[PDB]
Amino acid sequence: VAPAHLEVNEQTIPIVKHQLVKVGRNDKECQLVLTNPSISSVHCVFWCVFFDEDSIPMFYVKDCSLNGTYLNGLLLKRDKTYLLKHCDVIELSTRLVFMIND
Structure with missing residues (x-):
């Protein structure tokens, strides 16, 4: 049981x-x-x-991309750190759901 994982929408990433x-x-x-x-x-x-x-x-x-990354539907500022919460949704411009086990 990793501290957290990503559900990809499949496989999970710890x-x-x-x-x-x-x-x-x-x-x-x-x-x-x-x-x-x-x-x-x-x-x-x-x-x-x-x-x-x-x-x-x-x-x-x-985010460090050309086209952007979205957190709960909101475009991230490139290169800026964002604090995650359990069940946050990360969409790549593909849906990743961040899950905390810890």
Whole structure:
């Protein structure tokens, strides 16, 4: 049971400590590979932070794409960190649902 995972709309992608989870078209670099030609090579990235091992983790997404990433229907500002909440929906310009287990 990973701290959190992405449901892809299938397969789930875990989000664990000390890992940058990359979503994109480049199978040489991304943990979740999406083949739509309007998805960037690395499109958006997911990670988590623990202050200590007893901390409740916090989870983040950041867009780094050409065409944009949407969070609950709202366009993200490119390169800016956004705090995630359980069941947030990430749509790539494909639906990813962010689920917290921790």
